[PDB]
Every structure is written in structure tokens, then in C-alpha cells.
From a paper:
MYORG is a member of glycoside hydrolase (GH) family 31 (GH31) and, like the other mammalian GH31 enzyme α-glucosidase II, this enzyme is found in the lumen of the endoplasmic reticulum (ER). We were intrigued by MYORG, which is a type II transmembrane protein predicted to be comprised of a short, disordered nucleocytoplasmic N-terminal region, a single transmembrane helix, and a lumenal C-terminal catalytic region comprising a CAZy family glycoside hydrolase 31 (GH31) catalytic domain and 2 β-sheet domains. Here, we demonstrate that MYORG, enigmatically, functions not as an α-glucosidase but rather an α-galactosidase and shows marked preference for specific disaccharide substrates. Recent studies in diverse populations have shown a link between mutations in myogenesis-regulating glycosidase (MYORG) and the development of this disease.
Numbering used by the authors:
A (entry chain D): 88 to 165, 169 to 270, 276 to 713
B (entry chain A): 91 to 165, 169 to 270, 276 to 713
Amino acid sequence: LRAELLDLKAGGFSIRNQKGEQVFRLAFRSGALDLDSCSRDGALLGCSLTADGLPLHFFIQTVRPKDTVMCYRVRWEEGRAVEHAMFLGDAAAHWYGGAEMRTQHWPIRLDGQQEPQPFVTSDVYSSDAAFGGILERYWLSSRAAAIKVNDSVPFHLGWNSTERSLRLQARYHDTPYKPPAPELSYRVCVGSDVTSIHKYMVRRYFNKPSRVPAPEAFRDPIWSTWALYGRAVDQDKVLRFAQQIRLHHFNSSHLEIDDMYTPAYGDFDFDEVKFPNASDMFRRLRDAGFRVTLWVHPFVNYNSSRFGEGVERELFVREPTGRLPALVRWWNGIGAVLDFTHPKARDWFQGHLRRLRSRYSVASFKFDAGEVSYLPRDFSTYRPLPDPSVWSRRYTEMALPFFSLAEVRVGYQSQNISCFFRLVNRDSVWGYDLGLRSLIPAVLTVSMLGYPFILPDMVGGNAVPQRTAGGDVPERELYIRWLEVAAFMPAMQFSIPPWRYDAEVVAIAQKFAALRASLVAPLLLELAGEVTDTGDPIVRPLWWIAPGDETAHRIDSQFLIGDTLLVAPVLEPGKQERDVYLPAGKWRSYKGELFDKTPVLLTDYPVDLDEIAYFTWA
Amino acid sequence: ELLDLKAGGFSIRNQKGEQVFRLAFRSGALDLDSCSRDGALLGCSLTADGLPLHFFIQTVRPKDTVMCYRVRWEEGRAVEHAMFLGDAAAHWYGGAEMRTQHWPIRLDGQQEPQPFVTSDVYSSDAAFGGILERYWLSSRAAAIKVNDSVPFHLGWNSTERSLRLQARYHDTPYKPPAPELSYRVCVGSDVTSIHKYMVRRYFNKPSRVPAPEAFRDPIWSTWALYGRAVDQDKVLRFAQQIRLHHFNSSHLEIDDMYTPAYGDFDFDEVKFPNASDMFRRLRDAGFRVTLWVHPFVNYNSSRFGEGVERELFVREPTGRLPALVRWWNGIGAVLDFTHPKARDWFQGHLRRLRSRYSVASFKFDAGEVSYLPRDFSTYRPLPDPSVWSRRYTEMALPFFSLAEVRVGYQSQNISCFFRLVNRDSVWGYDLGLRSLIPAVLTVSMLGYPFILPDMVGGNAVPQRTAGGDVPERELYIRWLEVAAFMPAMQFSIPPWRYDAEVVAIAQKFAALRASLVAPLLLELAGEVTDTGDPIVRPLWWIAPGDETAHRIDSQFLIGDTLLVAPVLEPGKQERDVYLPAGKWRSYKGELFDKTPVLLTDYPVDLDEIAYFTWA
Ligand SMILES: *[C@@H]1O[C@H](CO)[C@@H](O[C@@H]2O[C@H](CO)[C@@H](O)[C@H](O)[C@H]2NC(C)=O)[C@H](O)[C@H]1NC(C)=O
Ligand SMILES: *[C@@H]1O[C@H](CO)[C@@H](O[C@@H]2O[C@H](CO)[C@@H](O)[C@H](O)[C@H]2NC(C)=O)[C@H](O)[C@H]1NC(C)=O
Ligand SMILES: *[C@@H]1O[C@H](CO)[C@@H](O[C@@H]2O[C@H](CO)[C@@H](O)[C@H](O)[C@H]2NC(C)=O)[C@H](O)[C@H]1NC(C)=O
Ligand SMILES: OC[C@H]1O[C@H](O[C@H]2[C@H](O)[C@@H](O)[C@H](O)O[C@@H]2CO)[C@H](O)[C@@H](O)[C@H]1O
Ligand SMILES: OC[C@H]1O[C@H](O[C@H]2[C@H](O)[C@@H](O)[C@H](O)O[C@@H]2CO)[C@H](O)[C@@H](O)[C@H]1O
Ligand SMILES: *[C@@H]1O[C@H](CO)[C@@H](O)[C@H](O)[C@H]1NC(C)=O
Ligand SMILES: *[C@@H]1O[C@H](CO)[C@@H](O)[C@H](O)[C@H]1NC(C)=O
Ligand SMILES: *[C@@H]1O[C@H](CO)[C@@H](O)[C@H](O)[C@H]1NC(C)=O
Ligand SMILES: *[C@@H]1O[C@H](CO)[C@@H](O)[C@H](O)[C@H]1NC(C)=O
Ligand SMILES: *[C@@H]1O[C@H](CO)[C@@H](O)[C@H](O)[C@H]1NC(C)=O
């Protein structure tokens, strides 16, 4: 059976574009159709029975929303689980989108075998199976086809590398999804090029942020206490850090005071031991020209002076019967988690944040955690969440009153929250496993999902022992190369500072701060103001401007800021040159060279330790 | 044998030809053409709808006078069989402690099968109480034991007078280690013989006897008298007042609340400034002391953190974190008595209280799985959740001599006292005066000889009290009188709360208990170890062929030789008394030797109980 350019068989379907290329192929894996049960009424193709003879609500509806776009609405509705296997295709077909992951490849590459698991916001820092804090049920092909899985679906995702398939599953057994009868539905749209079809899908499904964060956050470096000091942060260390930033002649968007400044997790005011005179600390920081943000989280531990208050006022996520709080474990221990569906728990959280601003003139907050992997398997909330990841959304709404200098590390339809979105903890390693090579794939993936204001975590990574190339801190060359690429991303955050290394590392950092300020920042601010209208990302893949270009489809070592700044950092140790691809148009190099014969690969393009290759539209 | 199997159910007859058991299949019907016989085994492979089935009936003749029928129905589809109680002449005993306790068993209205698990029935007429067994006995000398394997749920239907026996795994605290309903129906010559066979087969006997003074001297509890507000001064004033009114004491039981928070084991220094001195004074005044304990650690307990970190608590289903519970004293965790570490932790605190304060033993309160979460996990798995109650009652074993528990799930071989759940200060069968004999008989039937019928006069809860503030004078006296003849006797609201006559009546019944009742209780207690027979016996125990003895809920036996007939109604100075076969000497000296007989309008004044001794 043919529905426009879609071939339906018993065991699956395939779709072609007008050129006659196969741009989508899908197998039914929880059963087969009985084609004799299928009838066509206009654009609608419905089927009533499976091949085994079970009743079924299946349909394919053809929709022509534009002259150059054909969409296919698909529904398979049976307690029997639904699975369709979406084939990525041959080596020339490259896919983008889905979730932030621990090992982030661009284009998407998933190794081995994974049985479908809940497609929900998880902390992937320790897990290569899980799906990260920022995700969307959206996959885009370099062959100008895209799939959006319906928000209704109790959606689980697996993969099979042998047949290079995504396993799309709807199920209600062994999952944190509740019903408001499994149901897998989605829309496949086919366009003329990858950029056009992407823009159609983004405008249809994702909201835009309508505001821009503080302009200094797109220019001056952010300074975090976390990687430098860890939990042992205190009043003296914060002031010594602030002083050292000024003496080494660096600007600051703000200083972010991290874990731990409270006596217990759940308390909001300062530990009087480690911060004897917080008021004085903030007065000195204000006088020295530092805005300040504070690390906050949705947890109240059992030994918090606020745990009792939360239980009695019922501000916590509950066990399934909805009567008592449910205990959770996070990286800082055991307690409850605040229910952001509950107006009282929202007012309670907000009240403590407004008190910290009122008292200490704190500008905004680092909103840490927010993943449903830190909620119990099965739970209840003041308002029901059949889709559990909507809890992540509700937590990110806590940033709205302080959006201007706020960061969150989760996004579930959080795109219209006009704050920064931080990548989960990068490790001080070179590789794609949360390392230097993960940065461009991860930022591109997040940008694709409609989150323009991206903070790529910490320059040099978090320097976790056993996860650090160089033992104690990231090795010198890793720090420099990271610093360089980080200078061209929308927000830039140091923790382990340049003066931990040597005068040359400091000099390189000062150079990239100055270059960021004069070249990058004016363009970031223009593009940030443009988001409100266009909904286009700030960090763009090479294929954005060269959508018909197979090399631009594959590249993970280069990116664009808007359409006009092309960046090609060195991402390998012991290299003073790299290959640079210029995809289309005329490009002026940082040294003044005019390249007007494109597309072209520049072979062995010189880039010394203290340099990055960048090119501007001509 | 004498079992007729049809498609829709079966019936069983005794050798006299009476129908002693009738059961309907309610989750399907048998295809009789699928049934074949190999010796005593009758197996069937398909239902009437044509579904595959593991069904069998095996005939077993274990004794000359006993025929048993092993039945299995094994299908995720729930199994339900409806057991018919029969006509008005058929009377049934056993099952669970209930809020409204009738004898024989009477269940009103309609109840969908619900989990047959240890619950706190104080506020609930549907639920099954802390002491229960899947065991039902007929006055027609038939009994059923439901297999321990069954994920067993019980309902009832008063219209057809049926028990609804259900096996299901959906919406229940039962986990599997495929629903399965199996049971054994045994038929004997008389109700007492068949009961003794079933008890010896299924229930263990306690091999030890509690402290002899617990069967003689009254127990004194602070609970109904003082409530939570109990203090060091109040405990000492109570102890003094017991001595000044010339009463003996087995021991004084200090109840809720003596700790700063629930989960702490040592004394609140505010309400008990010098606990050591309090216990020294009580010891000098000749008082043994027991302490109220429970399996909960509240979130505001200084011990909650320790329990979380050492993982001593019942967990949520994934078995990683503690699960919070609500009980009558707030929100916290519950200790996992499947966990050796949590058992050692609990025991350690109890041994410290004995070592420090010379406390004799403990009141082990709660223990029902209705205070555990719907779905939970434990160090060792409990596919049958009520085994948690068993594991909690094992905490009494080292202090059994003066211990009480209020739950029993195969806890019979734990040689401590078993307390009825809170009696209310009312006359009726809803935890009132009329509930006492049915409840004690029901518990005795399940192989628990050492029974404590809670508090003389009840707990005096406002809105659940005949007389407002305390139980009305006549209720207190009648309760006191029947309580004097039960295996253990516990006052809380004391006689001197009322008047000199109530005190005098209490002193009389204390003296009578000491000289008549206590020597017999101790003999029968020592006999349990060998016979496994209860102390408190129904009239039908000695008169098993007697239809009147089958029905009576207002009389009981201590052993075979002491017959008790208390007044259980306000404004009555007489009652009808039934004497079964044999010769009886009344408390006034009258020889009744023309029996069985109904004594009509037998005089019993306010300060008296009717009792008779074998002659
Ligand atoms: C992953 O995909 C491969 C290829 O589709 C699956 O392997 C096939 O399995 C079927 C049985 O259903 C065999 O008859 C085929 O011969 C297999 N083909 C190959 C190339 O191995 C495999 O089953 C899938 N794995 C999972 C976990 O679903
Ligand atoms: C911001 O984005 C959120 C999330 O998509 C929008 O919230 C949805 O709004 C519609 C219309 O009111 C509701 O029916 C949905 O239930 C909302 N979803 C959630 C998860 O809250 C919100 O309206 C957006 N606001 C703007 C102005 O863009
Ligand atoms: C006391 O009673 C308990 C419970 O009936 C007995 O424990 C059982 O012992 C059997 C056989 O050794 C085990 O297979 C069961 O697992 C135990 N059941 C439970 C629920 O714990 C115990 O053995 C009895 N002890 C004595 C001496 O009578
Ligand atoms: O503790 C402060 C720290 O928290 C977050 O990182 C933690 C992460 O969420 C865990 O998965 C990991 O095991 O532990 C990390 C801390 O050691 C946060 O992302 C980080 O920036 C910092 O705020
Ligand atoms: O509070 C001590 C008290 O506890 C027990 O009785 C409680 C019962 O378990 C609850 O169901 C009821 O709602 O509240 C009762 C206390 O008010 C116990 O049985 C009793 O003897 C005493 O120890
Ligand atoms: C997607 O979900 C919406 C809301 O549940 C529903 O109306 C629509 O029909 C679904 N689409 C398909 C193709 O099943
Ligand atoms: C530092 O801040 C000052 C004041 O806003 C500004 O004029 C200057 O351009 C900034 N320099 C850099 C390198 O960011
Ligand atoms: C009762 O349960 C036991 C243990 O699971 C089993 O072996 C036995 O056969 C069952 N009895 C019947 C009658 O099904
Ligand atoms: C109770 O039994 C009657 C008569 O046998 C029957 O008609 C009725 O449906 C039963 N009720 C329930 C709730 O099963
Ligand atoms: C009370 O206890 C005393 C001292 O042990 C004992 O001699 C007496 O027989 C007991 N009397 C009663 C009525 O319990």
C-alpha cells in the first residue's frame, strides 16, 4: 500500500523524497499488520487487525503543510508493549538530536545493544546507557527527514548497532510513566534539505526564550569554586579566589559559590563556622566588583533542620499512595526531594531564594540536579505527572524570577526559560566520554533542541581523581586547548584557574579573554537578541550553511557562531596544525587570508599551542 | 471417598451421611471429561471454557477416625472458591481476631476478598486482626486449613453465608517466590477430636510457661489511667496507691510515652528526672517493671539517622532506601526483623534497659503488616508479608517470662502472653465486654494458650465510652469479674477511681482468682507443653455433640473442670446458665447432677459471677 511516497508492508514501511531517495525506513517489532484490514479515506490510511488477528488502532495520515514539506502522522495503539525499529540507513545518512549523553558523538553513534529504557531526564555522569538532563524525542537526518515522537507516548528508547536502528517503545510495565493501553505515535516530515526541515520541526514543536541573560555572561569569564576548592570551600578561600582573579587582570560576569556553604543539605543560610561573617564577605565582593550566584538543589536531607518542616507541610514528592514523603539518594546523601507541582513547595523554595537575595544581594542561583533519575522509580505528586520528566520542567521554572544570571542542567520543554543551560560535569580527559572531544557534539546536540544559551560546564573539567589526564589537575596542553574552544562558546566558566599552571597558561587565558571580548562577545549578544525572533541556536553545525554537504554532515571538530564565525580548535595533544573544512561562501582567516574557493579542506593549517583557527564571512 | 465432585463445585459427607462441607468454584468450572483417577488422586487438566488447569483432589486417611481431602486449583488469573457454612445447625470457629468478634463466626453484609494479613482492626470492621490463621472449624466435625503457599485473600457473602477464598497477585502485599488456591479439608467423629487433629498437625506448642505470678496477681498498666502524659511522680503515686489498697502485682507496665522521641530507648530526663531512683523505689516496694516498646523510629528520633546509615529499616520496593510509614504516634521508619543487624540493634537496646534499670521484660506493641508500606522489600524476602509479624514476635523470646505481643502468625511456640487489641469501654461485641469471650476463644482455638484480654474496663477513649470520662460503674464491675477468670488480668483505670464497694469487689475477685483460678491456670499452662490444648475452652470442648454448647458466647471453661457464666448486661441480677453433661458444684455449694440442663434466671448479684466446678 502506497500513501504518497510511503510504501507500507506487513512488517514495516519506508518513505522516499521527490528525488526518489529512501530517507526513512521502519520495522514493526511488536507484531505485523494484516494488509487486508487496511482501507484508505483521502489522506488517512487505517488498519483494524494485526497478522496474528488481534484488534488494532493503526493509521498513517499524509499532511502537506508547505510546498517543500511532506509529513506522515503514524499511530500504533494495541497491556501489550509497542516497539518500532527506526533504521538510520547507510554510511551517507547521519542523524542528530535526541538526548545529552555521557559519550557524545556527532553525528549520533550508539555502540552495542540497549533494550529500550525510559526516555527521561537522568544524570549520565556515571552511566553510558542513560539519557541526560537536556533531551527531546526528536531525530534529524542529513537526508532532510526528521521524526518527532508524540508527547502522549510512554516513550522508552533502545538501539541495535548490528542493524543501526533506534528501538522506539511504548510500555506501562516496569517504568516511571503512569497513564492519565500502550500507544506509539510520531510524525515523520521530509524536506528539500536538512536545515529547512530542521527549522520546520523546531518552529512546530519547540518554544523560544523571549529574554536574554545578563550581557556580561556572554563576555566576561564566570568563576566557580567547585573544581578548585570542592566541598571544603570557605569564606577565606572565596575572598582569596576573588583577589587572585583581580591580581591576574581578569574580568568576571560573577563568582559562583558552590557546594558546600550550608550546615546541612536543605538548610538555605550559611554555615557560621566556614562563613563567620557572610554579610562582610558579600560587602567585600561587591566593593571588588563581583556579582555572586549560589549553588542550590531540590533536596532536603534527613539531618537538615528543614526536613521536619517539609514532612509536616507535605512539600515533598510522595510514595505511590500519595500520603507520605519518599526518600531519595543523591551524590550528597539521603533525604526527600521538593515537589515542584505543589504551589506551597514552589513558594517555600522561592521564599528562601528571595531571602538570600534580600539579605546578601546574591544576583541569581546555580539550580543543580533536576533529573527524574533522582526521584523514586514509582512516586506521586500534588498534581499528577503521567510524563515524569515534566518534574524537570517544573524545577527549571524556579529559575524564571532570577533568569538573568541563572543556570539549570536539565531541559524538558524548558526552551522558553531564558537562562543558561549547563552540560553535566565534564571530566579532565581528551575523549568523547565527557572530555574535550565531547564539548562540540554536546553543545551542538543541545543547540539543536532549541536551547541557545549553553554553558559547557568547567574549563579543563572537574579534575576528579581516576578521571583526570595528568593526576591532580588536567595536564597543561588539555587545559590550554579546552580554554581556547571554551572562549568561543556562549558562556565561559573557569574553576581551576590559569595561575594554577604557569605564566604562559595565564598569558594564553588573558589573550583568549581579550579575543572573546572583542571578536566573540559582540556576535554572541547580536545572535542572543535574534533568538527571541528566529528561534535559531547560537552555536550551529557546519551543515547549517552547507546543508547539501556530506563532509559538513560528518564534522564534530568544528562549529559556527551564527552563520559568520567558523571555529576549528586543536583537540589532540602534541599538534601545531589541523585540517580545517570551509563548507561554503568566502572566509577571511584570523591572519587575514581570503579563502574564496569553497567548499575546500585546508590541509595542515598551522595552529600553535597558543592559537585557535577561526574564519569570518567575507 | 465421600466427596461428590460436579463441574461447579463439590460437597463432602461423613460416614453418618450428613453434608459437613460444600464449596462452589467462582473463577471458573471444571470439564469433568478432563478428570482421571490414579489411586486416591483425582486430577483434571481443563476448565469448562477449555483453559489448561492443574486441579486435583487427593484422599488421605491419616487416622482411623479422620478422612482428609487435599484440594488444589492452579491456573495471571485470580482463583476464588466460595466455602458454604450451611444451615443454622452448622456453626464455625477460628480465622482472625476482628473488631466485632462473634462466636460462632457471623459476618454481616458483603466483603470483596482482601489480603488475609495481620492488621490493626481497632478502627476497621473489614480488616483481619493481629492474631490469625487460615483455619476454620465446623460444629459438624469438619475443618479446613488453607495452604501456607497461597497468596490468600478472604471475603464473605451473608446472602449465601459463604467465605470467599481467593488466590491473587494483583493489588496485594503478597509477592511470588501464577495464582494457586490449595487447602486440606479433614472430617472427624466430633468437633473436639477433629480440632485436636488439625491443631497437632499445623500449630506448634509453646514449650515454656511465663512467670507464675502473671497467672495470679493483677498486672498494672499506666496507659488507660495516665495516657501519654505519664511521669515519674505518676508512676510512683500509682505504685503507692496499689499497695495502700492492698493489691498484689505481677508487675507495673510503664506505657507510652517515657522517651523524648519514638525510636529513642532511654528515658525523657524532663518527665523522668531520676529513672534509676524511680526503679530503686519500685524494687524496694516489691514491683517488677515492664516497658512499652514498638518497631518504629520516627524521623525526629536521634536514632533515625543511625537506622538509615546502617540500613536497619524496611525498604521501598527496589531495596535501596528506607520506606516511611505512618502509625498512631506519627511518621518514621519500621525496623526490618528479617535483618540480623536490625534484630541485634533492637535486642541490644532492650538488654541495656534490663542491665541499667533491672526492667524484667517488655510490652511489644504493634507488629501488624498494616503498618508496613503496601509494597516493600526486606533483607530476606517475605512472599507472605505476615511472616514479618512472626519475626517481630521472636524479639520477645529472650524476655518471654513477662513479655506480651499483640500479633501472632505461627507465633504459638513463643511462650509469652498474647494481648487482644485495645478493648473499648462499651458493652457490645465491637471491642466491648461481649467481645471478650468470643475473642479469647478465637485466639485459644489458634493454639495461643497464654491470653491477656487487654485492659479491665477498656481504654476509656472519649466517644467510645459508656459513661463519658471512665466506663460506668456496672460495666467496670462486670468486666473486672470476667477478667478475674482469664489467664492474665490487667488493670489500668484502678478500682479506687470509683468507690469503696468497687474496691471491695476487686479485692474479693483478686482473692478468688488467687485461691480458685490461679492454681488451675498454672496446672493447665504446664499441660500445654504436652497436650497443646488451650487454657480457655468453649463449652463444646467437653460436650462436642451438644448444639447449645456449639452456640453459646456468654460462657467458657478454664480447662475441663471450671465453668464460668458472667453477667454481660446492665441492670441484671440473674442470667440463664447452660450446664453440659457431667456433675457441677456451684460457687454456693449446689450440686447439679441432672445434665445437660438450662438453669433459668440463675441469681448473680452485682458483686458476683456464676461459676461451677466438676464433681
Ligand atoms: C539486533 O539486530 C539484529 C539484526 O536485525 C538481530 O539479529 C537477527 O535476529 C534474528 C532473530 O530474530 C535472526 O533470525 C537473524 O538472523 C539475526 N540477524 C543478524 C544479522 O544477526 C538481533 O536479534 C537484534 N538484537 C536485539 C537485542 O534485538
Ligand atoms: C513555555 O513552555 C511551556 C512548556 O512547553 C508551556 O507550557 C505549556 O502551555 C500549554 C498552553 O498553556 C499547556 O496546555 C501545557 O500543559 C504547558 N506545558 C507544560 C509542560 O507546562 C508554556 O505555555 C510556554 N509559555 C510561553 C509563553 O512560551
Ligand atoms: C517455632 O515455629 C516456627 C514457625 O512455625 C518454626 O519455624 C519454621 O521452621 C521450619 C522447619 O524447620 C522452617 O522450614 C520454616 O521456614 C520456619 N518458619 C518460619 C515462618 O519461620 C520453628 O522451627 C519452630 N520451632 C520450634 C522449636 O518449634
Ligand atoms: O557537589 C557539587 C557539584 O554537584 C554536581 O556534580 C555532581 C554530579 O551531579 C554527580 O553526578 C557526581 O557524582 O558528583 C558531582 C559532584 O561531585 C554539579 O554538576 C557540579 O557542578 C557541582 O555543583
Ligand atoms: O499509645 C500506646 C498505646 O498504643 C496501642 O494502642 C493504639 C492502637 O494501636 C491504635 O490503633 C489506636 O488508634 O491508638 C491506640 C493508642 O491510643 C496499644 O494497644 C495500647 O495498649 C497502648 O500501648
Ligand atoms: C498525538 O497525541 C495527540 C494528543 O494525545 C493526539 O490527539 C494525536 O492523535 C496523536 N497523534 C497521533 C499521530 O497518534
Ligand atoms: C572588562 O570590563 C570593562 C568594563 O565593563 C570593559 O570596558 C572591558 O572591555 C572588559 N574587558 C574584557 C577583556 O572583557
Ligand atoms: C501446599 O504447598 C506445598 C508447598 O508449596 C506443596 O508442596 C503442596 O503440594 C501444596 N498442597 C496442595 C494440596 O496443593
Ligand atoms: C452473594 O451471593 C448471592 C446469592 O448466592 C449472589 O447472587 C450475589 O451476587 C453474591 N454477591 C457477591 C458480591 O458476590
Ligand atoms: C500476694 O502476695 C503475697 C506475697 O508473695 C502472697 O503471700 C499472697 O498469697 C498473695 N495473695 C494474693 C491474694 O494474691
